[PDB]
Write an enzyme that holds these catalytic residues in place. Structure first.
Site, mmCIF file in Angstrom:
data_model
loop_
_atom_site.group_PDB
_atom_site.id
_atom_site.type_symbol
_atom_site.label_atom_id
_atom_site.label_comp_id
_atom_site.label_asym_id
_atom_site.label_seq_id
_atom_site.Cartn_x
_atom_site.Cartn_y
_atom_site.Cartn_z
ATOM 1 N N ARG A 1 -52.251 -6.303 -7.737
ATOM 2 C CA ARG A 1 -53.663 -6.283 -8.183
ATOM 3 C C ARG A 1 -54.128 -4.871 -8.566
ATOM 4 O O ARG A 1 -55.014 -4.704 -9.386
ATOM 5 C CB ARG A 1 -54.579 -6.899 -7.115
ATOM 6 N N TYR B 1 -48.447 15.821 2.459
ATOM 7 C CA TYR B 1 -48.534 16.431 3.805
ATOM 8 C C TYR B 1 -49.208 15.443 4.740
ATOM 9 O O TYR B 1 -50.099 14.673 4.325
ATOM 10 C CB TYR B 1 -49.330 17.765 3.783
ATOM 11 N N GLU C 1 -50.661 -0.391 6.617
ATOM 12 C CA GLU C 1 -49.840 -0.751 5.457
ATOM 13 C C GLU C 1 -50.732 -1.420 4.409
ATOM 14 O O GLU C 1 -50.572 -1.184 3.203
ATOM 15 C CB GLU C 1 -48.670 -1.661 5.876
ATOM 16 N N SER D 1 -41.640 -2.568 -4.640
ATOM 17 C CA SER D 1 -42.520 -1.840 -3.742
ATOM 18 C C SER D 1 -43.638 -2.769 -3.239
ATOM 19 O O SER D 1 -43.462 -4.013 -3.211
ATOM 20 C CB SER D 1 -43.048 -0.587 -4.435
ATOM 21 N N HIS E 1 -53.062 -13.349 2.700
ATOM 22 C CA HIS E 1 -54.204 -12.401 2.873
ATOM 23 C C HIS E 1 -55.592 -13.111 3.020
ATOM 24 O O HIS E 1 -56.640 -12.515 2.770
ATOM 25 C CB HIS E 1 -54.265 -11.366 1.750
ATOM 26 N N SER F 1 -28.544 9.099 -28.608
ATOM 27 C CA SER F 1 -27.288 8.526 -28.088
ATOM 28 C C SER F 1 -27.331 8.254 -26.597
ATOM 29 O O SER F 1 -27.857 9.074 -25.835
ATOM 30 C CB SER F 1 -26.125 9.468 -28.364
ATOM 31 N N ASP G 1 -21.013 11.518 6.054
ATOM 32 C CA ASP G 1 -22.046 12.340 5.364
ATOM 33 C C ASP G 1 -22.030 12.071 3.857
ATOM 34 O O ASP G 1 -23.109 11.963 3.234
ATOM 35 C CB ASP G 1 -21.908 13.859 5.670
ATOM 36 N N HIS H 1 -36.582 8.783 -7.118
ATOM 37 C CA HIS H 1 -35.277 8.139 -7.323
ATOM 38 C C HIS H 1 -35.138 7.867 -8.826
ATOM 39 O O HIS H 1 -36.023 7.283 -9.418
ATOM 40 C CB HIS H 1 -35.245 6.824 -6.531
HETATM 41 CA CA LIG Z 1 -50.543 12.599 3.385
HETATM 42 ZN ZN LIG Z 2 -47.559 -6.990 5.124
HETATM 43 ZN ZN LIG Z 3 -50.098 -7.814 3.164
#
Ligand SMILES: [Ca+2]
Ligand SMILES: [Zn+2]
Ligand SMILES: [Zn+2]
Ligand SMILES: *[C@@H]1O[C@H](CO)[C@@H](O[C@@H]2O[C@H](CO)[C@@H](O[C@@H]3O[C@H](CO[C@H]4O[C@H](CO)[C@@H](O)[C@H](O)[C@@H]4O)[C@@H](O)[C@H](O[C@H]4O[C@H](CO)[C@@H](O)[C@H](O)[C@@H]4O)[C@@H]3O)[C@H](O)[C@H]2NC(C)=O)[C@H](O)[C@H]1NC(C)=O
Ligand SMILES: *[C@@H]1O[C@H](CO)[C@@H](O[C@@H]2O[C@H](CO)[C@@H](O[C@@H]3O[C@H](CO[C@H]4O[C@H](CO)[C@@H](O)[C@H](O)[C@@H]4O)[C@@H](O)[C@H](O[C@H]4O[C@H](CO)[C@@H](O)[C@H](O)[C@@H]4O)[C@@H]3O)[C@H](O)[C@H]2NC(C)=O)[C@H](O)[C@H]1NC(C)=O
Ligand SMILES: *[C@@H]1O[C@H](CO[C@@H]2O[C@@H](C)[C@@H](O)[C@@H](O)[C@@H]2O)[C@@H](O[C@@H]2O[C@H](CO)[C@@H](O[C@@H]3O[C@H](CO)[C@@H](O)[C@H](O)[C@@H]3O)[C@H](O)[C@H]2NC(C)=O)[C@H](O)[C@H]1NC(C)=O
Ligand SMILES: *[C@@H]1O[C@H](CO[C@@H]2O[C@@H](C)[C@@H](O)[C@@H](O)[C@@H]2O)[C@@H](O[C@@H]2O[C@H](CO)[C@@H](O[C@@H]3O[C@H](CO)[C@@H](O)[C@H](O)[C@@H]3O)[C@H](O)[C@H]2NC(C)=O)[C@H](O)[C@H]1NC(C)=O
Ligand SMILES: *[C@@H]1O[C@H](CO)[C@@H](O[C@@H]2O[C@H](CO)[C@@H](O[C@@H]3O[C@H](CO)[C@@H](O)[C@H](O)[C@@H]3O)[C@H](O)[C@H]2NC(C)=O)[C@H](O)[C@H]1NC(C)=O
Ligand SMILES: *[C@@H]1O[C@H](CO)[C@@H](O[C@@H]2O[C@H](CO)[C@@H](O[C@@H]3O[C@H](CO)[C@@H](O)[C@H](O)[C@@H]3O)[C@H](O)[C@H]2NC(C)=O)[C@H](O)[C@H]1NC(C)=O
Ligand SMILES: *[C@@H]1O[C@H](CO)[C@@H](O[C@@H]2O[C@H](CO)[C@@H](O[C@@H]3O[C@H](CO)[C@@H](O)[C@H](O)[C@@H]3O)[C@H](O)[C@H]2NC(C)=O)[C@H](O)[C@H]1NC(C)=O
Ligand SMILES: *[C@@H]1O[C@H](CO)[C@@H](O[C@@H]2O[C@H](CO)[C@@H](O[C@@H]3O[C@H](CO)[C@@H](O)[C@H](O)[C@@H]3O)[C@H](O)[C@H]2NC(C)=O)[C@H](O)[C@H]1NC(C)=O
Ligand SMILES: *[C@@H]1O[C@H](CO)[C@@H](O[C@@H]2O[C@H](CO)[C@@H](O)[C@H](O)[C@H]2NC(C)=O)[C@H](O)[C@H]1NC(C)=O
Ligand SMILES: *[C@@H]1O[C@H](CO)[C@@H](O[C@@H]2O[C@H](CO)[C@@H](O)[C@H](O)[C@H]2NC(C)=O)[C@H](O)[C@H]1NC(C)=O
Ligand SMILES: *[C@@H]1O[C@H](CO)[C@@H](O)[C@H](O)[C@H]1NC(C)=O
Ligand SMILES: *[C@@H]1O[C@H](CO)[C@@H](O)[C@H](O)[C@H]1NC(C)=O
Ligand SMILES: *[C@@H]1O[C@H](CO)[C@@H](O)[C@H](O)[C@H]1NC(C)=O
Ligand SMILES: *[C@@H]1O[C@H](CO)[C@@H](O)[C@H](O)[C@H]1NC(C)=O
Ligand SMILES: [Ca+2]
Ligand SMILES: [Cl-]
Ligand SMILES: [Cl-]
Ligand code: NA
Ligand code: NA
Ligand SMILES: [Zn+2]
Ligand SMILES: [Zn+2]
Lengths: 693, 693
Positions: free
Chosen positions: A155, A217, A369, A462, A498, A573, A609, A632
């Site tokens: 959204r 930060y 979140e 994401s 939701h 190219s 590693d 990335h």
């Molecule tokens: Ca921050």
């Molecule tokens: Zn969730």
């Molecule tokens: Zn959610």
């Protein structure tokens, strides 16, 4: 004391009990109730046997409606009388009608305002929806209120797209076409969204920044905060979500142009005219929003538990999922958080009998979140140096179910072999697959489009807490849950997402009565963590990255090849990118041979590693264009839909809509620059797998 | 097979022979002769016994005068006749008068142009010199040609400062006050600069970028290059350097204002009037530059040698210095390159007898250092992922001598203890210190201002090839050479720097006849590499970083405290920074105890990783404001003088000249932001030394 011991200790009945416990009251980020739950989880993880369990707190920008000044939308007449008003709250479900502190539906981070104007209907408010309106239909959204159906994309992208079309407000609604599955009843008698149901959710465009006020930060006690005007990702126009009973009232009077085709029509008994404004009789009536929500810096709390490694304590395998919910969180997130709880309990049972994993396992209960991945991102910003030098892997743990059909896994190619092998060892919970493996049922229901006898595994997108770990820091990441059949179900996500209707009873009655899908997902997430934390050699196969890199290079080349004349004129190219992918393939093959061929703990750890830093090699410290926290080079969230992963995003965005750019030499020069960046990064990643000296 | 074996094998006579060999012809970057020398070094390092020796090449922007269209400056009259012309070349030294391909004096990367105008004399063209001119003297440089003396600061800063004052050209010259030591004769009969001598040198402001056309990414075969107009760091006005015979002719006619004080007067028999323009009789005469140099993409070659580690091959200790010179490179760089050559030879002698260092040693012969650290920076951009995960330390190896008085060491605090201990084990080469340690002579001649019985060690600045390794990538870095007595010698650097007079004979006759200072420096640089590559526990002491962090926090606080009223008004506190430094001090002390207290190779290597990543922790991936390649939060090159290191540079620059900013609330808000950034970074670095789980 092996994986089987771990896995056998997990109980469906425990997950059910925890889910009940976590879903009796709302746990909105920044509220007292969610702080109380944080303290409960901390106490119980200590009880379960973890070595330390701490709260990590931050003071971040959150958003809340004004309790004494409610948000709503009106149809007003020429006199200024409000002749229709949208609902102030969702009708509470049976037995919850006395629960207090249910936040009313709102769009988190909306600015305040009371804009009035004529409505334009913009379908799903996707980039192509706005292309069609402006370019093909010649409809100007400037100074209009737009009404968009939820679905198809995040959204926040809908709102950005409306803003750039010059809208002065956005109304989001849930169409039955997208939130009502045919032949199933509305909550409480089935799992469909009722006409009074409304989807909450933030409308930021943070592009990985975390707290809008402190990009880069952690929002700690002495943090310097940007002023609101310089905050990251806030919308500039008011926004509010509604249900389909209310949407019908706003849409039924719509005039102007007809919908351009059937993909613009939902299921309501209205024409779906684009507008602008209403049909002749009602042409002087307007729509008016009333938004009074406030942004406020508020304290949030992550719970961080540590199970110290016996052999490599400085190597971290992270299992993380959020705890804050919009209302009761019956699916999102508590179906995940209950699974994490039981995983901690099982690991802790082994620990009490004297076992330790080889590597350190970190367990996280993230906060905020729902307001922009804020808890996971501030914590990762605080601990970035530890994570980038020590972070083996991140397994997410939000909703354990969004359907009851089959497994869904999205993860880095580095985890494909781990997932195939683990699922071959797990029992399928599916009807008709009794005594068969999870691998067999999953592969049958969700076949790979490339390879027979293999299941489909999606790229990570994401809209969840793995974003900072994967696309910012380049730590190998994965997620897994049970899902629906996308082929036969045209609705977006699960219908009660939701909403106040997303309850314990939703899950217990309709999704997973026996808690077997929950248990299957605890086995997959827990089994992955177990292997990552305990396998002598890290369970990553670099050759699987080589195969996908070739697939992505073919795809991006094919996009560019729609423009053969420009590729000639500007000498565009892809040779360097293919060369790099060829080299990666060859070096990865050689690395795999050496990994098979070596009592030497330094050679081992040197090679562990190399395995751990391989995801890290795909990070470019300069970031992607105007998105500095998406670093990335192989995977970024789509710039048109945060939920969807895009491959070679830098080249993809340089090519997108390129035929419309006014300066083709400049535009194709940037395509070539992104080709160079991608080829270089692939080659540089390949070279981390070469012999070290 | 220990350090003593390594050190005893090094021979003064070998260094002398190599220096002779490297200095017979010019080795200008991008020329055939420098490619031939690269191939010679590659061959000999192979012969000496290294495991592999490769050339790494890049195609970078370089700058050269036009051979058929020479650069020069004129005094012109009102008719347009050129009545005085500056020299076209330096008189070649005895016996070199037939050497071809001596590049004439020029300022590398100057744009082309032929500007005419009136002269303003700007002293050393420092920030404070321009402050004095514009603010105090009310002299406007806009559209004037400025004439500046070399010295005190990097010439690139002089040019940036002139450009921002609105100059239309810059003339640099060597004043005898700054390049002629009293009582010593001009070359060839002493080490002073003759009146016809001229200092070459680039005038870029790259701020760490490397090749102007490819910031961030190696200038490889498929690189996408910026156009010239978007290149990093190029000057926008023509610039040319001259000697003091020519400077006298340009300065002797200067009118307008008197010099403001004696610090503006050099040693020539002229008034040093600031101008603008000439005195009455000559007021219609003007100065005209003629610059025709061209920028050209040109191939450069680094030589990379590898001596693979026996135990930790994936840990890299790097000894690197450049090979390209302006002309013969008698001091700069071949006095360093000869020392490196002999170090490779000694290590190779041990290797042939069956020894290997514990960790891998990489040896580098960099190209194009004189044109902006281009060779080291492109190589580090190509190999950044390997360097940041595996790079233990970088020891530079440019000029081995700039005087004959005492040792000079600039390095990270992490190397202080290593350097003190090594120098206590080395013989002093100094007259009057026969049978005493290098530590004793050094400490006596260069006492620490803080601690009795300790020598002075400077912060690393820049203007050399360690810049990418230290301030971009955060790899612990150091440098060492013999130097002059700064207390008794007011001249800037060594007088024959970057002139045709800098020859083998300069060194053999005047600086180091017996090659004992060269040998001492080979022992220091080689001894450091030996310990870093062979010590079981990395020879870094984190507690030394704690002591300096406190000193820097005191210093920056003291700067801010000149503005007590603004600190009150804007609530500017340093409390967080001091708290972080206190915490670092406590955690480092505890880490040191654990390091003393542990047969376990994982605990060891875990703790060696904590030691190696500690310098890395001071990197901020967002960089410093408008200087994205200066990422170290504790040390950056001074924004007023690239050669000098600045501590807490982000706060320092936020405070600099703050009383002149038009919006104090904004300016002090940025001071507070930089305080937050610094405190956070110090705390985050401290936390890498905490127990890992
Ligand atoms: Ca921050
Ligand atoms: Zn969730
Ligand atoms: Zn959610
Ligand atoms: C140097 O190292 C020390 C550690 O020894 C750090 O000290 C921390 O300092 C911060 C203050 O900046 C403290 O933060 C405060 O935390 C309180 C809750 O802490 C509890 O929970 C933690 C773990 O979750 C425990 O470790 C801790 O012992 C407590 O049980 C909050 O209640 C405080 O907020 C209240 O007061 C402030 C200030 O007046 C108000 O602004 C708030 O509105 C609120 O009312 C506060 O946030 C922290 O507790 C300290 N940690 C420890 C372990 O002691 C320093 O931070 C560090 N220096 C730097 C620069 O990092
Ligand atoms: C995939 O992996 C392979 C390695 O197997 C890489 O191959 C390299 O490709 C580049 C071309 O892009 C080659 O570069 C060329 O190098 C020549 C000199 O190379 C010598 O020296 C190196 C080490 O210093 C040795 O390894 C090598 O064997 C040689 O002895 C140059 O002379 C070439 O330049 C000339 O031609 C070009 C192109 O026509 C012109 O533009 C120039 O002006 C010039 O005349 C060229 O620069 C390199 O040699 C190859 N390496 C190896 C080991 O074979 C691929 O680069 C890699 N893919 C990616 C994307 O990295
Ligand atoms: C839609 O809602 C508006 C506004 O109503 C207000 O806000 C909502 C979110 C709810 O919380 C409501 O309870 C709340 O009142 C309605 O318009 C408003 O109507 C009221 C009552 O008619 C007006 O208030 C007063 O009316 C008395 C009449 O005796 C006067 O003495 C007062 O001077 C005052 O006018 C109010 O002015 C008016 N507000 C606006 C902004 O228009 C509207 O009736 C409703 N429409 C429906 C249900 O169709
Ligand atoms: C300073 O230098 C200028 C330019 O001289 C030129 O560039 C230098 C870098 C050297 O490489 C010189 O060898 C080179 O010529 C001198 O001004 C120039 O003088 C010459 C000769 O007088 C002029 O050339 C020609 O003169 C003949 C006369 O017979 C005519 O037939 C030609 O038509 C042509 O004019 C030239 O025009 C003039 N150039 C400029 C740009 O002014 C200058 O004399 C000298 N000053 C000194 C030594 O004091
Ligand atoms: C979800 O489960 C948790 C954990 O079982 C429940 O919290 C626990 O509740 C019990 C009973 O209220 C608490 O014990 C009580 O302690 C107080 C003194 O602190 C005492 O007065 C009582 O007599 C009783 O012994 C216990 O502290 C608490 N545990 C934790 C870790 O918080 C919680 O109530 C459950 N929530 C729901 C909605 O079911
Ligand atoms: C998922 O399971 C597969 C199948 O078990 C794993 O691949 C197998 O890994 C083993 C152990 O490295 C390989 O054994 C090796 O065989 C060669 C003989 O050819 C020998 O040189 C070695 O000493 C070793 O015994 C085996 O070949 C390989 N099988 C296949 C079909 O690839 C895979 O590693 C598992 N994936 C993960 C991430 O654990
Ligand atoms: C600096 O020292 C180097 C290394 O000693 C000198 O280069 C070397 O020069 C010798 C003599 O010219 C070369 O040997 C010759 O080889 C050719 C065939 O390749 C042959 O025709 C000759 O008869 C002779 O044997 C040798 O190749 C060369 N070595 C290397 C590694 O380049 C160099 O000349 C010295 N430079 C100065 C200015 O003193
Ligand atoms: C530079 O040399 C100094 C002086 O030799 C080094 O400090 C010394 O390091 C040794 C070895 O770690 C320390 O020995 C330890 O002593 C304690 C007993 O108090 C014991 O617990 C340990 O097992 C060990 O024997 C010694 O205390 C220490 N001396 C001082 C005065 O600090 C220093 O490490 C060297 N620096 C570098 C970078 O190598
Ligand atoms: C919620 O909305 C109300 C408006 O109904 C806000 O209260 C008013 O704020 C203004 C400006 O500060 C005052 O002049 C009024 O006296 C207030 N009115 C009433 C009736 O209290 C209130 O600030 C908002 N609340 C929050 C938490 O933002
Ligand atoms: C060096 O300078 C000369 C000027 O004396 C340049 O040569 C001239 O360039 C122009 C424009 O390309 C031509 O029209 C002339 O015919 C050239 N003149 C002569 C006498 O050759 C030359 O391009 C410069 N060289 C370099 C390498 O940049
Ligand atoms: C849309 O409407 C606004 C304001 O009425 C106008 O300024 C703008 O240029 C229009 N845009 C297009 C593309 O027609
Ligand atoms: C559960 O599975 C059955 C059988 O396929 C299906 O008909 C039902 O719709 C599913 N329930 C949910 C909530 O998806
Ligand atoms: C200096 O001179 C220029 C051009 O003659 C003028 O535009 C500029 O404003 C002057 N600046 C000051 C500070 O006097
Ligand atoms: C070398 O040292 C002597 C004795 O101190 C000194 O007089 C001389 O100037 C020095 N030479 C150089 C080049 O610094
Ligand atoms: Ca570059
Ligand atoms: Cl998830
Ligand atoms: Cl040096
Ligand atoms: Na319910
Ligand atoms: Na000489
Ligand atoms: Zn040099
Ligand atoms: Zn130099």
């Amino acid at each position: 004391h092996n994986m089987k011991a771990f896995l056998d200790e997990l109980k469906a009945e425990n997950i059910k009990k925890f889910l009940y416990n976590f879903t009796q009251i709302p746990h909105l980020a920044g509220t007292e109730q969610n702080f109380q739950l944080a303290k409960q989880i901390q106490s119980q993880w200590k009880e379960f046997g973890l070595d330390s369990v701490e709260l990590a707190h931050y003071d971040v920008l959150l958003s809340y409606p004004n309790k004494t000044h409610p948000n709503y939308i009106s149809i007003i007449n020429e006199d200024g009388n409000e002749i229709f008003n949208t609902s102030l709250f969702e009708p509470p479900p049976p037995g919850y009608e006395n629960v207090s502190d249910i936040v009313p539906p709102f769009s988190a981070f909306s600015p305040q305002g009371m804009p009035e104007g004529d409505l334009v209907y913009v379908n799903y408010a996707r980039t192509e929806d706005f292309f069609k309106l402006e370019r093909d239909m010649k409809i100007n959204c400037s100074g209009k209120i737009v009404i968009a159906r939820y679905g198809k994309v995040f959204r926040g992208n809908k709102v950005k797209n409306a803003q750039l079309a010059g809208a002065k407000g956005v109304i989001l609604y849930s169409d039955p076409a997208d939130y009502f599955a045919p032949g199933v009843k509305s909550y409480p008698d089935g799992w469909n969204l009722p006409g009074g149901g409304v989807q909450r959710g933030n409308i930021l465009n943070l592009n990985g920044a975390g707290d809008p006020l402190t990009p880069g930060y952690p929002a700690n006690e002495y943090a310097y905060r940007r002023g609101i005007a310089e905050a990251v990702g806030l919308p500039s126009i008011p926004v509010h979500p509604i249900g389909y009973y209310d949407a019908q009232k706003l849409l039924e009077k719509m005039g102007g142009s007809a919908p351009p085709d059937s993909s613009w029509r939902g299921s309501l008994k209205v024409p779906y005219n684009v507008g602008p404004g209403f049909t002749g009789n009602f042409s002087t009536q307007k729509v008016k929003m009333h938004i009074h929500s406030t942004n406020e810096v508020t304290r949030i709390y992550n719970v961080i538990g540590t199970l110290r490694g016996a052999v490599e304590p400085d190597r971290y395998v992270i299992l993380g999922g959020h705890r804050d919910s919009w209302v009761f969180g019956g699916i999102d997130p508590q179906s995940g958080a209950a699974v994490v709880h039981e995983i901690v309990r099982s690991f802790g049972t082994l620990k009490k009998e004297g076992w330790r994993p080889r590597r350190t396992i970190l367990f996280a209960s993230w906060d905020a979140e729902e307001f922009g991945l804020l808890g996971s991102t501030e914590w990762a910003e605080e601990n970035s140096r530890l994570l980038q030098e020590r972070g083996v892997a991140y397994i997410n743990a939000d909703s354990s179910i969004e359907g009851n059909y089959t497994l869904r896994v999205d993860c880095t190619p580095l985890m494909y072999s781990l997932v195939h092998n683990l699922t071959k060892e797990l029992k399928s919970p599916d009807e008709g697959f009794e005594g068969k493996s999870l691998y067999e049922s999953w592969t049958k229901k969700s076949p790979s489009p490339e390879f027979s006898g293999m299941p489909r595994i999606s790229k990570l997108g994401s809209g969840n807490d793995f974003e900072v770990f994967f696309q910012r820091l380049g730590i190998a990441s994965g997620r897994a849950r049970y899902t629906k059949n996308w082929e036969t179900n045209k609705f977006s996500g699960y219908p009660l997402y939701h909403s106040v209707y997303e309850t314990y009873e939703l899950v217990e009655k309709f999704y997973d009565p026996m808690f077997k899908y929950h248990l299957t997902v605890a086995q997959v997430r827990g089994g992955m963590v177990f292997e990552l934390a305990n396998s002598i050699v890290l369970p990553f196969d670099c050759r699987d990255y080589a195969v996908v890199l070739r697939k992505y290079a073919d795809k991006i080349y094919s996009i560019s090849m729609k423009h053969p004349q420009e590729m000639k004129t500007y000498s565009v190219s892809f040779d360097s990118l293919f060369s790099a992918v060829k080299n990666f393939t060859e070096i990865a093959s050689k690395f795999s041979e050496r990994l098979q061929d070596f009592s030497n703990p330094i050679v081992l750890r040197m090679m562990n590693d190399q395995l751990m830093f391989l995801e890290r090699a795909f990070i470019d410290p300069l970031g992607l264009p105007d998105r500095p926290f998406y670093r990335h080079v192989i995977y970024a969230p789509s710039s048109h839909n945060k939920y969807a992963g895009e491959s070679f995003p830098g080249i993809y965005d340089a090519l997108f809509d390129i035929e419309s750019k006014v300066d083709p030499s400049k535009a194709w020069g940037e395509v070539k620059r992104q080709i160079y960046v991608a080829a270089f990064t692939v080659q540089a990643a390949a070279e981390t797998l070469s012999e070290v000296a």
